[PDB]
Amino acid sequence: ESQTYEVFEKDPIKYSQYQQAIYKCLLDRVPEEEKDTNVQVLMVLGAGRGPLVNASLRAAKQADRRIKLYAVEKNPNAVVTLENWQFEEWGSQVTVVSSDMREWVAPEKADIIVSELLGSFADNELSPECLDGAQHFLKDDGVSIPGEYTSFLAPISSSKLYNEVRACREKDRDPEAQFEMPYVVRLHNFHQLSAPQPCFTFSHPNRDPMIDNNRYCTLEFPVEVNTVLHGFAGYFETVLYQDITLSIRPETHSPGMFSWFPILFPIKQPITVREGQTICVRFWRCSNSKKVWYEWAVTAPVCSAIHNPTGRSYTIGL
């Protein structure tokens, strides 16, 4: 909705980071001597209401380089804002494309593809599937911004949050479905039980034929306290370009960036953990041609059921 895009746009840090990443990329791709002859083809894939298009133009002005922009957006409502911006301000330099990036027959190949398709758990908004489909229109030496992203998990204790998930039982669905789905939540009254560890990584462009975005990860968390396990906090980090990054991992959190709150993967039944024990969690990234989902289980100190098998309670539409 319009107000959702308006909330995204209120984050000053995110876009100034994208601008810095595009600025550095343009300087690395066009030497000073090629300044006036070399026009870089930039595609903003999932343009929303235009902030990354504006970030790209500011980046090209500060780099003193020439750019040719395409703003690709599948949401026709946002396409209205983009087309009004294109007529009133941008002009011919920007070509607005109302299309899914996975279907678009691009008329030219790109030097740089810029996107912000990231969720609180990095790949949960389906950035890998979207950029995999767009990959064929990026030149052989082309750059994708972001270049990489990694999700992180950390075990947490919160009887407050456990009870909050418990109260999400709805009519006409499995009485335990609320425990088999992640929640975006600004975690407050909780205890992080072990240091966040990396879960899943994706790199763009993807040069491992047939890709396979499905994943299976085992994580072993040392616990130094007596506690009760209620779920896993999820975070992410992303490399936009080289040293220009964004992070919501508490230890490396980008200062003043509020676009993403952590994600929470609950467990159906609370698990008693004694000091010195290890929490072993298993996470899977699954898919078919229609949906993507996560499945998860605790195997130490005790086993839990596998949560969300076959995406029965939660799926992410393709």
């Binding site: 959702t4 909330v7 969720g119 609180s120 929640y183 975006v184 939540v185 600004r186 509020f258 676009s259 993403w260 709150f261």
Partner: peptide, 8 residues
């Protein structure tokens, strides 16, 4: 906010 919708 923070990449979420719904709730109450």
């Amino acid at each position: 906010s923070g990449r979420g919708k719904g709730g109450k």
